[PDB]
Symmetry: D2
Subunit: 316 residues, 4 copies
């Protein structure tokens, strides 16, 4: 998986992700309207106060999101964090206790600013409990973003709960976020500027085409390598103007780092690949997506009809 | 630039390219209909035998294509070949002489099968002449494909005129095609299959995520590196079924090897990037494309209306 | 810098390092004999319990070692750890306080087995103080080894004092040791076994020579890259028999990952390179070394003469 | 294999090679004195006129060299060139016909200047014949050097006989020399100068140690990769002064690109590795070498005794 966020010149946020997996899970776009029942395992039951949109699965009326974006421009995506993610055995007295799957709607229902999320997370405890005993707990970490900033939330056996500022605007998979940040220093030799003709003891050695400054940029799907390339692309992509251009910029970056079917076979013999790419545009409250087997950009929107519906809206 | 072709389970061809450039050319989609005027510099002027679709510019009613696909399923794309491409000073007696830009319509108008193109090219000479004196000659090489096979055409100072079979179904830029084919042998260590946990003198060393078998696959835009990656992706991508899935597969591969804006700055100070990606589906006679600043898949079709028009149709 | 250890089939230890620097320090081989004065900043002054050999400089009769090996087969090497190393502001009550430079002789004078060093380090505090005001404190981390095991000692602002088991038998420079161990999982695609001929959609793609399984092994001098290569080489080098063969194995590995003069220019404009490579053989109590400008293997030995001298012996 | 040459500040040549193999050939240092019998398969028999030194095997009194250096400062090394090397089925009328193994002594006995070798090779034909029926013909290519220049000699099925100027001073294995020269342009992003701290959208991204400018330099033993690294190291290594420093520089470079035992396992299951490294100093007429299992620098010399001996001198 790869998460990505950036803004245009006017503070309009474009934020979304690739889902990289070994099979399709039957997921689809879900709009959860305002005032929808919202039960919690450890907090009081309530209702949604903000409409949200994103990709996921409905389990007994509960929209279980892989990524989720609210009508006020704040979103969260859960990405795989294997060999690291570990949540608490039960609830802890005094904390805001969330079963880990509940973070998606807890963040999107209760906040519009990442600065407020970061403060509240200081007293949050994520619990190792699924929606019901039939389900496995997903070993996730999360990227959360508004138009001003993005944070990473990781809860691991190694380090406990950590919250990081993410000025790069990207996230992939394991290892932990500080490891990846540290890894970037090993790629300071990258430069968008082309090399020029050289004399190696009088032998003319000159580029054959453009791109020579990025020698050493990895193109494989190892999470550390996708992190380096996604960060490098995001920080060097110019700011662009308008909805079409920013959505296109978003898909240009995420499709560059997509996991291409047939190029990765996991140890169990299945192809791992980017099953979908999705972008939420806060300015238009529109969720854009395409799939490995259908490249057409589909659009779904939070508007006066969908935000005020009396049931979940699901698209398949 | 990257050119790409493959087929589905039933011989339906998907063939197209990324156009990677550092300046604007004002290109757009052009349909050239049947029976349309077709002048040649060194051959008799004639009319089109069949309809074609592709991306290009119109110069005095002449559709000058960057990539061209005919209604019978045969296409050609011209890609940059700097430091290598060199054409003849003038026409040569006894040869079928084409100004280099004329190869696009000569191939697509006169043939259906690459095997026939390959035989005809034995007597073709490409000439260093532009469409008119206001244009420079583009230093190109070409990929030509039907549903059965693809060939590369290169005319260089180094090697003269060469025609290669291209079972990889890809082409990028310089150096020459045999150099790239030879380079692939240095990447035989690539393996789609993930590594598994290992013991390094008793230290458990294990993958953190999937993808470890392709260690060393380059992700930069140097032509040799995009060639390796595009070839690796194309030959390992499963065959898929149906128009939507094959078009999606095509864009999945080409967007993976696209030149991303801001990541390449040429020696003149300008960004080099993939300005458009295009796919021609022979089965539906449809040209699909999107652009760096507009990701929506646009479609243009050779149909009973467009193939029989009286003028060029430009979008 | 790169530190390296391994044993032969008989438990004979070979342990040493490359010194990679941008300026020379005038170092040379020093033997410190038994019963030699040994002052400490924060502990009682004493005399040496054991003879030691290694590379260093002498400061007012004190041998300040870059790497140090005792007559009982235990050694230590200090390697650069910039942007991480941080020692305490003065001594701390209730700890065994050592100025960081004193760790070299504290380890080699007081112990034979790493297991005892590891336990003793639980009560050690390293202090940010140099031997005298003429010297800065070097930002180091250390590898310590006997014939059974090796440990890494790191004291950082980020993590405090950490002691790690080092089954790989290698160390380089920054970042921290756990970062490097974690990085190895990203190189599990490395395989000593050559690839073989492949069919890329019918194009025969075959190796041109041996080595194809290690595609992606980095050859630059960035510390993380030398760590990967040094670890990979050490764990895959077979065990070899006898003194000459093991010393040769040792130099073969460290010269492979040497920092070659002219290939690295630091931000202050100076060449950084491997100024010397050194190997201590515990079995023969012999220190072997060569230098960037003199490749002859020089040898120096702890023996009944040198171990019992009344002064430092310098070469 | 890797071949390497360079000079000091005064035109003194240092020239030699790594021998990287996957079996034992029984090689040793051979001095062939003046006036030694020199039979030819397709030329009149003669005797040696110049003493030579190098590594090789003796076959029924004939010194068959892997590398060979004459007393006048001109040398030649034969390196593997598999999947390319192809010699003629028999002798060709009008040419100077040499069985391929005979080039070693033909070059070193008849010339002192590469410029003269280059001219003479215009009429040389290499023949696919071994010294006797118990040996296979080795698929080699050659680097020949004097103090002024080096040339590469390749005879392939692909290209026939080609002779290249080698300003890089290096050679490895397949593919052909022009392919490798062309490959270097893909590595122009290499820079010995370290990167410095950067701001990635306000995230401070800074090097952890020196070496960052050579990101992408390959460290594996694939011939194309060793060619890039050896060329990069040779052209960036400063010119150094004096015999000791130049021999050291030479071994520093070749040991950096050595094939390390255990890191390469061929398709037959055998370790491929650098079995020896050797350097000929023309100024001292001295052949320096060491071995995978014995790192001591051994020295063998052409002097008034060895050059005038009555039989081969073997070590
Ligand atoms: C259920 C197993 C957990 C196994 C484990 O802990 O080893 C998880 C391993 C990878 C996870 C998936 C992977 O993280 C990608 C998706 C992320 C999304 O936020 C949840 C659904 C996901 C589709 C998710 C569902 C749970 C699995 C499939
Ligand atoms: C629906 C698929 C199974 C598909 C199949 O039949 O193979 C399930 C496999 C793993 C489950 C997910 C996994 O258990 C993690 C989450 C658990 C949570 O309680 C519900 C949503 C979850 C995100 C959940 C949603 C349903 C999937 C994605
Ligand atoms: C080689 C590295 C750091 C230099 C570098 O890698 O750039 C260090 C490893 C051992 C250190 C030396 C060793 O600790 C002994 C001396 C200690 C003193 O405080 C500083 C100078 C010293 C003489 C010091 C200088 C820096 C080196 C030589």
């Amino acid at each position: 998986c790869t998460g990505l966020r950036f803004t245009d010149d006017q503070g309009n946020l474009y934020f979304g992700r690739n889902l990289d997996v070994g099979q399709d899970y039957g997921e689809g776009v879900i709009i959860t309207p305002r005032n929808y029942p919202l039960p919690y395992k450890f907090l009081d039951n309530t209702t949604t106060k903000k409409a949200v949109i994103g990709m996921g699965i409905v389990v007994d009326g509960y929209p279980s999101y892989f990524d989720c974006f609210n009508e006020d421009g704040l979103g969260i995506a859960g990405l795989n964090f294997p060999h690291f993610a570990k949540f608490s055995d039960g609830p802890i007295d005094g904390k805001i206790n969330l079963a880990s799957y509940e973070i998606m709607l807890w963040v999107t229902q209760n906040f519009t600013k990442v600065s407020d999320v970061k403060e509240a997370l200081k007293n949050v405890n994520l619990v190792n409990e699924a929606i019901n005993s039939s389900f496995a707990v997903a070993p996730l970490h999360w990227i959360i973003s508004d138009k001003d900033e993005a944070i990473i939330v990781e809860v691991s056996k190694q380090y406990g709960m950590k919250v990081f500022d993410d000025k790069l605007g990207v996230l992939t998979n394991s290892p932990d976020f500080n490891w990846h940040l540290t890894n970037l220093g090993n790629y300071t030799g990258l430069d968008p500027h082309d090399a020029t003709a050289q004399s190696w003891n009088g032998q003319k050695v000159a580029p054959w085409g453009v791109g020579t400054g990025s020698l050493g940029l990895p193109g494989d799907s190892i999470p550390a390598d996708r992190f380096v390339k996604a960060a490098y692309l995001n920080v060097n992509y110019p700011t662009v103007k308008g909805e079409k251009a920013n959505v296109a910029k978003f898909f240009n970056i995420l499709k560059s780092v997509a996991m291409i079917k047939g190029s990765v076979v996991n140890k169990l013999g299945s192809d791992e690949y980017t099953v979908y790419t999705a972008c939420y545009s806060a300015a238009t409250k529109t969720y854009y997506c395409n799939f490995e087997n259908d490249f057409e950009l589909k659009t779904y929107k939070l508007d006066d009809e969908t935000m005020n519906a009396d049931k979940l809206i699901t698209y398949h």
